Amino acid sequence: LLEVPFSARGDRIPDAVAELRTREPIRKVRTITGAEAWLVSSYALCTQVLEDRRFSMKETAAAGAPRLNALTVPPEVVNNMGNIADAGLRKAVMKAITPKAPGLEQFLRDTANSLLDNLITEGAPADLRNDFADPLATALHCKVLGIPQEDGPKLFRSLSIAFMSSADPIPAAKINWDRDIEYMAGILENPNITTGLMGELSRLRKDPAYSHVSDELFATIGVTFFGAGVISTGSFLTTALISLIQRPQLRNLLHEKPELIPAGVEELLRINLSFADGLPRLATADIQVGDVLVRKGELVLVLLEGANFDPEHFPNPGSIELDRPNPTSHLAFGRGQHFCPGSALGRRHAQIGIEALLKKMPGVDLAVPIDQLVWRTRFQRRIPERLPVLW
Template sequence: MGLPLTSTKTAPVSYPFGRPEGLDLDEAYEQARKSEGLLWVHMPYGEPGWLVSRYDDARFVLGDRRFSHAAEAENDAPRMRELRTPNGIIGMDAPDHTRLRGLVTKAFTPRRVEAMRPHVRRMTASLLRDMTALGSPVDLVDHYAVPLPVAVICGLLGVPEEDRDLFRGWCEIAMSTSSLTAEDHVRLAGELTGYLADLITARRAAPRDDLVSALVEARDAQGRLSQEELVDLIVFLLFAGHETTASQISNFVLVLLEQPDQLALLRDRPDLLDNAVEELTRFVPLGSQAGFPRYATEDVEVGGTLVRAGDPVLVQMNAANRDALRFRSPGVLDITRDDAGRHLGYGHGPHHCLGASLARLELQEALRTLLDELPGLHLAQPVEWKTEMVVRGPRTMLVGW
């Protein structure tokens, strides 16, 4: 039979679709899923690329090693901002990606993460006590959604508690989709590198039972990563372990408040909590656009399109999670859905989110505590949304009880 010949690159369609505010998935994705082949799109900067929006196509690209992350550095990759910055471990292929991932994987195994549950549950209870002591209304983002994942990942890494607020500002800049100036990048890089150099020096002199100490040991005694890789890996873990989970805590609460039937069912059936977190992960379109393009290293058929070697491919996992060919009534939130866990919210393949177990735990416990302790939880004012960010979610979300 051979590869299909639907590889014509017409005038590229402007991308991303829709606005970053709110949690609606733009209808253009539905049209893209229904169209023949893949859609040829262009982002504000870089060359055009193929947009993948169907579930089977997304899973195929994410799991196939013929699509390279590392090749992004050699090309004018599709992107939201003019300035190009290194992607660290995300921008690597095997064997480098495998080597660095292996250094931290053991810290995020389901068994080790589950052992953290009592500690995370105590943290959510403490944060809720502090939040409710301020009186209603209060910002759920500042006083609950952000502090929890920051405390968890910083505690795991060994970042002192008094320094944790620094990372929110750094993360806001690093995950912005606006045009980061060279001066901003130099400042951010300098502040982070300087801080982490001091932290690494402190752990080298006096190791502790934390992940930074383990990585320093891997660097110094085992030679398994370079100094630059050591810093980049810590930065990646700090950012990846903070912004996405913080945004999803707020997003999940908002969606449940807007769908009282599902919220009532969850309160009635607390045994559905784990499945509800999976369904909310499937349902909520976290990413404001497809990111981290992969480049085909040879001609590959994807969804009826012949992707030529050297073509960039953008995988939109939010759209894939709303594919009617994979999920029944995909635009409906159903916390009893029996296949919710098949979502691509944490990716798939070699770059599957290594912190997925930890994110699930934090989301489960954050919702559990709110549902148990605040039966009257409600939105007190309209949400103020983040703009020009990689992930979508409330910037402020005032709630009452």
């Protein structure tokens, strides 16, 4: 039986996705746990699944369900956004993580420019993942959360394990989870934390209108938004920079006309292979999806690059076109109930990171042949361990 995932490489889509989309856009596969699942790979069917709440994210955590991979968080946390909504906290969380907070965009620029200055001073080769994209992501999310910049690196080092995609439970994941929860609980008791997401959560925690919300949920919001945000933005920016380096004509165009960078980033989002696995959902009813009657209790995997390279929806899908008529209709941030709450911040992180890099390193290029990149395996993202460049 066809095993997923197909390839950990984030620099090229396997030829098999297109043939699967054409012939079997919903197809039975085996996951790394040994469970069976339905892999959905066309734009039409991917959108159907994500927009039908009966395909439940929450129920993927039920005991005895077929699993894509092992949980790395407590089962209740799989429903974290539903818990946030039920607590009446959605508006406050969204307001705290907008890229339009005063001084945040300028903080992003100053930080990106400082990171790039340090690389230039040290001399090529430079590692654009470990010494640019991930530190930029980490610094951004410390500022967004309102926590000390010096705490970022230790929090960041949990993520190589927290976002593993493993057949079995991971002992280190619980060690790091409990420790990072204790950190965020301490932050909520820290009177000097008055800004960002944790500053706001700290205030709502003492507000009688939120008296019933548990201290547990408040800390969980901090841990999960730091982790999801840092791993997602660092990983997306890293693999977007590869796609840009691989396209010197686009690199030069965006350097010459940086007003096109937002449109470029939107296409880089569309063609991005950062998510290593399909998005998992558990059917809570018998539901027809294409030629398959998905049965209650079965696992469905929504393959984002299946949708995003679907030639029916995105003609010439492998080509970056800055003037498509449906440019944000990609699924890089998902779709439906669980659409990424950090999408605006993720866009701005990448836009500013690319703007700064192209200004400082207009001649940026890989310093090793592309096949020498080492792609992380059994992880929820596809990323190179190091991204060596010259300029």
